[PDB]
C-alpha cells in the first residue's frame, strides 16, 4: 500500500476538495466524525482506502489532505462544515489577503512568504506515509492563488519530492462563471511554469460543466455547489482505482504510462455518462452500449471540442456499477465501426478497461439521480488543443495593447515572462498539430 496526498489550492480547489471528500466518505462508509465501522483493523492497516485515509488510535480515518488558501473565508467553511471533525487544524492553511486574481501576487509576493509553511505541513503528512506515490493538486487556472501559488508549489514539490508523481485537476476559465478579465493571463502563466512539473493534468472547463448542469440536470442557473458535485463524481471515478481493490491505474505512475506517451501532451480529456436529474420520478436505465456510446458525444465531455477532428494517443474506460466485460466488448465493437475514432500510427488502437462493481454514489439531496451503471472515459486526444487555442487567442488580444500588464509588473514580475509563457503555449500548440494532423 502506497499513500496519495491531496493538495487543494485556492477557492476552486478547496471547494472542489470538500465536495470530493464528502463523496469519498460516502463511498467508503466513513461517517463525518471519521469512524468507519467496516474497518476491523482499528488504528492501522494497508487496505485500499488507506491510500487516501490514515487512521488514528481512536478509529478516526483522517484524509491525507491539506487545504491552502491566501484568504480564510473559504477554508473556514471546512473548519465549521459537516466534515469539520474529519480534518485536524494543521491540515487547513489560510492567509489574510488573497492574490486579487493576480498570478504575480500569488506566485512572488504572497507565495514567497507562505510557501515554506505549506511545504512543512505537507512534510508532516509525508512522514506518515510508508511509501508515498505522489500528489494530487486541485486548483483553478484563473484565480490568483490557484494559478500563482500552485505553480510555485509544483516547483518546490519537484525539488523536495523529485521521484514522486504529480497529477492535476485544473479548472479552465469560463466567462459564464468567470470572476476576472485577466484569467487568460493567469491560465497561460501557470501552464507555462507548471508544464514541466505535472505528469498528468485533467482539465475541467466550467463551460462544459455549466451546460451539463443546465441541460442534463434541468438547472436554470447552476451554482458552484451544483458544479462541484458533478466535478467530484468525475474525480471520484478517476481516483477510484487508487482507493479500491483493482488492477487498472493502481498507482499514480500508471496514469502517466497509460495516458501520456508524450510528456508535454499530458492533458487527457474526460467524458462522463450518464448524468440524470434526480427530480425525474422514474429514470430509464441506460445500458453498457448506450453509456459507452455517450463517451463520444461532445455534449458529455469536460472540455467542449470535437475529437472526430483529432487523433487519439490513448483511451481508458472506467466503469462503475452493473457492468461485465462481455457487454463492454460488444459496445466497443459497435462504436469502433460507426463512430469516427482515429488513432495515431505510433500507438496501439485499443482500450484499457476498468470495472468497479460499486455503482456511483449520489450525495443525499443532490442533483444527480442514482444510476445502475456509469462510465468515465479518459482519452488523450489532440482535439483538446482547441481549449489552448481559445485561451491563447484571448491572451493575444489583451497583450497586444499590454492591457492589465502593469498589475503583474507591479508585483515584481518581468514583462518578459509574459512573452516567454506565450511562446511555450505556441510550442505546445505546435506539438499537438504535429501529432494530430
Amino acid at each position: 500500500m502506497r499513500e496519495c496526498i491531496s493538495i487543494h489550492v485556492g477557492q476552486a480547489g478547496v471547494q472542489i476538495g470538500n465536495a470530493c471528500w464528502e463523496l469519498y466518505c460516502l463511498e467508503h462508509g466513513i461517517q463525518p466524525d471519521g469512524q468507519m465501522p467496516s474497518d476491523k483493523t482499528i488504528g492501522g492497516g494497508d487496505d485500499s482506502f488507506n491510500t487516501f485515509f490514515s487512521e488514528t488510535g481512536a478509529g478516526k480515518h483522517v484524509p491525507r489532505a491539506v487545504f491552502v488558501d491566501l484568504e480564510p473565508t473559504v477554508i473556514d467553511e471546512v473548519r465549521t462544515g459537516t466534515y469539520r471533525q474529519l480534518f485536524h487544524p494543521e491540515q487547513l492553511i489560510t492567509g489574510k489577503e488573497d492574490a486579487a486574481n493576480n498570478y504575480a501576487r500569488g506566485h512572488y509576493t504572497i507565495g514567497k512568504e507562505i510557501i515554506d509553511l505549506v511545504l512543512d505541513r505537507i512534510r508532516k503528512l509525508a512522514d506518515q506515509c510508508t511509501g508515498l506515490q505522489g500528489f494530487l493538486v486541485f486548483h483553478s487556472f484563473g484565480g490568483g492563488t490557484g494559478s500563482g501559488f500552485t505553480s510555485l508549489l509544483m516547483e518546490r514539490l519537484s525539488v523536495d519530492y523529485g521521484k514522486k508523481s504529480k497529477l492535476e485537476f485544473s479548472i479552465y476559465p469560463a466567462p459564464q462563471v468567470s470572476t476576472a478579465v485577466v484569467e487568460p493571463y493567469n491560465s497561460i502563466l501557470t501552464t507555462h511554469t507548471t508544464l514541466e512539473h505535472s505528469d498528468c493534468a485533467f482539465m475541467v472547463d466550467n463551460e462544459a460543466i455549466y451546460d451539463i448542469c443546465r441541460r442534463n440536470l434541468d438547472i436554470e442557473r447552476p451554482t458552484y455547489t451544483n458544479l462541484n458535485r458533478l466535478i467530484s463524481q468525475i474525480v471520484s471515478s478517476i481516483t477510484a482505482s487508487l482507493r479500491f481493490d483493482g488492477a487498472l491505474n493502481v498507482d499514480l505512475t500508471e496514469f502517466q504510462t497509460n495516458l501520456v506517451p508524450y510528456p508535454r501532451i499530458h492533458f487527457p480529456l474526460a467524458t462522463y455518462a450518464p448524468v440524470i436529474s434526480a427530480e425525474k420520478a422514474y429514470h430509464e436505465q441506460l445500458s453498457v452500449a448506450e453509456i459507452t456510446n455517450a463517451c463520444f458525444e461532445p455534449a458529455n465531455q469536460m472540455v467542449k471540442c470535437d475529437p472526430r477532428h483529432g487523433k487519439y494517443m490513448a483511451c481508458c474506460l472506467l466503469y462503475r456499477g452493473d457492468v461485465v466485460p462481455k457487454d463492454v466488448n460488444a459496445a466497443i465493437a459497435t462504436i469502433k465501426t460507426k463512430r469516427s475514432i482515429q488513432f495515431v500510427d505510433w500507438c496501439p488502437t485499443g482500450f484499457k478497461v476498468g470495472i468497479n462493481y460499486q455503482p456511483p454514489t449520489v450525495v443525499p439531496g443532490g442533483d444527480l439521480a442514482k444510476v445502475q451503471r456509469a462510465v468515465c472515459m479518459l482519452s488523450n486526444t489532440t482535439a483538446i488543443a482547441e481549449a489552448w487555442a481559445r485561451l491563447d487567442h484571448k491572451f493575444d488580444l489583451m497583450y497586444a495593447k499590454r492591457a492589465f500588464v502593469h498589475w503583474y509588473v507591479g508585483e515584481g514580475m518581468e514583462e518578459g515572462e509574459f512573452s516567454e509563457a506565450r511562446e511555450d503555449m505556441a510550442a505546445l500548440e505546435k506539438d499537438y498539430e504535429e501529432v494530430g494532423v
Partner: protein, 331 residues
C-alpha cells in the same frame, strides 16, 4: 437584430448573401474579428472552428462543415471512395482513380497493362495532362491523381462537343440535402477531337483557348438541355441523368454525415457544394469532383443566394415553391 461577420472577401456567393442580409433590415454586419456574432461567412482556409460555440447567449452558425474537405480534394475523394464501405471500391459512378505521390503507382500499372493487354488516362491535382501513355502521365506528376479519361463522352449536336454539368447542393444544419433546381452545362465550343480546348470543358479554357458560338459563354441551362434530350434522344433530363445525379449526391453526403454532422455540437454548420458530373454516350452519369467553395452562373446568383438565406440562415435565425429539391435521406 442578428449579427454576422465576413471573413472571405473573394466569395462571389456570400458577398451577395451579405448584401441580402443587410437588405432585410434585420442583420447587422460586424468587424471580421468581432467574436460576438451569430453567423460567420468564414475564410476558405484555416477556418478557426475551435473558437466557435463558446460565446454565452450566442447561437453561432458557420457556412462550412469541418472535415468536408475530405470530399473536396482530388486525393481525399479518391481515398474516401475506396476505403469507405458505403461507397466501396466497386463504386460504379466514380471513374477508376489512383493516388500517385510525386502511393498507388503499382496498382495503376497493373490496370494500365491489363487494359492494353481504350487505355487513356488524365492526370490532375490541386495543369492537366491527358495522355495515352503511362510514361508521360507519371513523368508529368514528378516534374496528383491519375484518373481514367472518358473516351466516349456524350457530345451535343450541333457542334459535336463535350460538356459537364454543375450541380449546386445546399446542406443545412439539420443535414437536409437540398439540390438547386437550376443547373448549368459547361460545354466545349470546340468539336471533340480524340490540343486540349475540346477535351477540357473548363470555362477559362473555352473563353481563352469558337467561344460563345453555340451557347452564351458555353453555358447551357437545364431547360435547353432537357429540350435537346427530348428532341435528339426522346428522353428527359430527369430520367436519363437527374436521377443518377441525386443518387450520387446523396451517397457522398450520407457517407461523411457521421464525421461532419453538428447535430449535438456546440456550433452549427451549413455549406454549399458544387458537384461536377460527366455524362457518357450511354447516358450514364459520372462524378468528376466536388467543389467546396463554388461560384455560380450569373443568371442564377439571385435565386440561389436568396434560397441560401431562406433554408440555411433564416431557418436558424428567422426574420420578421421551393427552389430546392430535398433529397430525402435517413439518419
Amino acid at each position: 437584430m442578428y449579427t454576422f461577420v465576413v471573413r472571405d472577401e473573394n466569395s462571389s456567393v456570400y458577398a451577395e448573401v451579405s448584401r441580402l442580409l443587410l437588405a432585410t433590415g434585420q442583420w447587422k454586419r460586424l468587424r471580421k474579428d468581432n467574436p460576438r456574432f451569430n453567423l460567420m461567412l468564414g475564410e476558405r482556409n484555416r477556418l478557426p472552428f475551435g473558437r466557435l460555440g463558446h460565446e454565452p447567449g450566442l447561437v453561432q452558425l458557420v457556412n462550412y462543415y469541418r472535415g468536408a474537405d475530405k470530399l473536396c480534394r482530388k486525393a481525399s475523394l479518391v481515398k474516401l471512395i475506396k476505403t469507405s464501405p458505403e461507397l466501396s471500391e466497386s463504386c460504379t459512378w466514380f471513374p477508376e482513380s489512383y493516388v500517385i505521390y510525386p502511393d498507388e503507382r503499382e496498382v495503376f500499372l497493373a490496370a494500365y497493362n491489363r487494359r492494353r493487354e481504350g487505355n487513356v488516362w488524365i492526370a490532375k491535382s490541386s495543369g492537366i495532362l491527358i495522355s495515352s501513355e503511362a510514361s508521360e502521365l507519371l513523368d508529368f506528376i514528378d516534374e496528383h491523381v491519375i484518373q481514367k479519361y472518358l473516351e466516349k463522352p456524350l457530345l451535343l449536336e450541333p457542334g459535336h462537343r463535350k460538356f459537364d454539368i454543375r450541380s449546386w447542393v445546399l446542406v443545412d444544419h439539420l443535414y437536409n440535402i437540398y439540390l438547386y433546381r437550376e443547373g448549368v452545362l459547361r460545354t466545349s465550343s470546340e468539336p471533340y477531337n480524340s490540343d486540349k480546348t475540346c477535351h477540357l470543358t473548363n470555362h477559362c479554357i473555352q473563353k481563352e483557348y469558337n467561344y460563345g458560338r453555340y451557347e452564351e459563354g458555353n453555358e447551357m441551362f437545364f431547360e435547353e438541355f432537357n429540350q435537346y434530350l427530348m428532341d435528339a434522344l426522346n428522353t428527359t433530363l430527369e430520367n436519363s441523368i437527374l436521377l443518377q445525379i441525386k443518387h450520387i449526391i446523396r451517397s457522398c453526403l450520407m457517407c461523411i454525415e457521421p464525421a461532419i454532422s453538428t447535430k449535438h455540437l456546440h456550433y452549427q454548420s451549413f455549406q454549399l457544394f458544387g458537384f461536377d458530373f460527366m455524362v457518357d454516350e450511354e447516358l450514364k452519369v459520372w462524378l468528376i469532383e466536388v467543389n467546396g467553395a463554388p461560384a455560380c452562373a450569373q443568371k442564377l446568383y439571385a435565386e440561389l443566394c436568396q434560397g441560401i438565406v431562406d433554408v440555411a440562415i433564416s431557418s436558424v435565425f428567422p426574420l420578421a415553391t421551393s427552389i430546392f429539391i430535398k433529397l430525402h435521406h435517413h439518419h
